[PDB]
């Protein structure tokens, strides 16, 4: 519902969706070749299935195809300084791909907007929605459209006859953070087959050890997992699958 939905917002009104309580799987994202660009900073995407994060924030917007280079830490531009600014120490990455077949119209898709004027550069991870007319003269514009009262936002001319740089592109950026809270979102790791009656090196949710996993009718264990003895020895364990 985030990467490919039927309705995506503009760059100046980028939708922010929180991903939490999720068993994330970035492997299918890596193996997908339908994304034009996929590169991450600070964390290599190869081992994203290992690290665990407390929360995940995803931002989705549609920008010009050539304007994709400005969405990066330490990048100065027009949309970067007026629509979406990223922190220098940003954790996460952007994933973008060509979407001319849906976001471009023969008569021109004019349903998308981008801001060209603001008083000052916006701080990283900030949203500006006010449509006030940017003034450049001495007399107050008072919101009346006319000369020397420039509208901060304009529309893209997304048409199939435009060049690749001018073609519409869909951008989705995911972010990670760590704070004083239990981690909830990360990969599912994996699970091997079970072999019994042979000396193996088992691993049951951190229960590291060796032994022969014979079948035993010990007791009911209505909600317990482990099983202990007079000393601190894990006599019996319950299968998780």
């Amino acid at each position, epitope marked *: 519902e985030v990467f490919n939905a039927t309705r995506f917002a503009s760059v100046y009104a980028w939708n922010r969706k929180r991903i939490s309580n999720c068993v994330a799987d970035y492997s299918v994202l890596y193996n997908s070749a339908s994304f034009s660009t996929f590169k991450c900073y600070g964390v290599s995407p190869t081992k994203l299935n290992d690290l665990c994060f407390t929360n995940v924030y995803a931002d989705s917007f549609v920008i010009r195809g*050539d304007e994709v280079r400005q969405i990066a830490p330490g990048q100065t531009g027009k949309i970067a300084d007026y629509n979406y600014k990223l922190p220098d120490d940003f954790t996460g990455c952007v994933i973008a791909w060509n979407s001319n077949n849906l976001d471009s119209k*023969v008569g*021109g898709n*004019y349903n998308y907007l981008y801001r060209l004027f603001r008083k000052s550069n916006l701080k990283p991870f900030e949203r500006d929605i006010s449509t006030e007319i940017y003034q450049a003269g001495s007399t107050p514009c008072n919101g009346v459209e006319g000369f020397n009262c420039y509208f901060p936002l304009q*529309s*893209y*001319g997304f*048409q*199939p*006859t*435009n*060049g*690749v*740089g*001018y*073609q519409p592109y869909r951008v989705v950026v995911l972010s990670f953070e760590l704070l004083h809270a239990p981690a909830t979102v990360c990969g599912p790791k994996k699970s091997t087959n079970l072999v019994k009656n042979k000396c193996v090196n088992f691993n049951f949710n951190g229960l590291t050890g060796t032994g022969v996993l014979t079948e035993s009718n010990k007791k009911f264990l209505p909600f317990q997992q482990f099983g202990r003895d007079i000393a601190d020895t894990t006599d019996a364990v319950r299968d998780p699958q």
Partner: antibody
Framework: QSVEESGGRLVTPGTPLTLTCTVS????????MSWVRQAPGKGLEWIGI?????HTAYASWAKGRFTISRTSTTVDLKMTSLTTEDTATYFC??????????????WGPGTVVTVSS | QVLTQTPSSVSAAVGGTVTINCQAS??????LVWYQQKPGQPPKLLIY???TLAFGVSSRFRGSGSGTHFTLTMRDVQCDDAATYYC?????????????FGGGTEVVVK
């Protein structure tokens, strides 16, 4: 990848004419065809372009008197109501690859269309 | 929408260098290409994206510039470089008339 065209003739003003540009050695449905013209001793001028899908684009100075059509192997353009200042040399240019429009890496021999009495 | 090339004509010796400037009336990022047209010959693509040399062309041709100003300079021009050069760049679609060509310049080597 060889591109050639022909159809240059001497015609009276207002008489329609057809120039056909033929592709060779590549698939037409993958690259975009465009037409440029230059007057004798003058600079280059852009006429129009057709995309691989089939959409058409033109130039404001042309005013919309040209027509670009596509088919199997004949990229042809037709005009109507020629004037006396249209005596020039016409070209059809090929692209490099998918997308990257307005590159014009391959060019034809070039044909001259003259209008006089 | 408007493309301007300066100077219109410029000459230099074989052991010399010249500069050609092509300015765009609108922000085009780095979407600009150059061509060389010998008299009576089809133009040849020299530099695309304003900084990338085309295949099969010499390394003495270099391009630079971004935004609205671009510059192309020839180092150690030979007698084979006597031709005309043009700059072409996209102008969006709803914003400008697709693509327009520059006025061009003539280069003669003594």
């Amino acid at each position: 990848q060889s591109v050639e065209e022909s159809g240059g003739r001497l015609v009276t003003p207002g008489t329609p004419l057809t120039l056909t540009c033929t592709v060779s050695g590549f698939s037409l449905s993958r690259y975009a065809m465009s037409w440029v013209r230059q007057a004798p001793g003058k600079g280059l001028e852009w006429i129009g372009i057709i995309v691989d899908s089939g959409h058409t684009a033109y130039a404001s100075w042309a005013k919309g008197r040209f027509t670009i059509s596509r088919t199997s192997t004949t990229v042809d353009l037709k005009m109507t109501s020629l004037t006396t200042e249209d005596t020039a040399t016409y070209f059809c240019a090929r692209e490099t690859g998918g997308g990257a429009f307005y590159v014009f890496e391959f060019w034809g021999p070039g044909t001259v269309v003259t209008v006089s009495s | 929408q408007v493309l301007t090339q300066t100077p219109s004509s410029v000459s230099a010796a074989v052991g010399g260098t010249v500069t050609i400037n092509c300015q765009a009336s609108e922000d085009i990022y780095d979407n600009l290409v150059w061509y060389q047209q010998k008299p009576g010959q089809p133009p040849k693509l020299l530099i695309y994206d304003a900084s990338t040399l085309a295949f099969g062309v010499s390394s003495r041709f270099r391009g630079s510039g971004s935004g609205t100003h671009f510059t192309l300079t020839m180092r150690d021009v030979q007698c084979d470089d006597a031709a005309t050069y043009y700059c072409q760049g996209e102008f969006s679609c709803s914003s400008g008339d697709c693509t327009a060509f520059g006025g061009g310049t003539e280069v003669v080597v003594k």
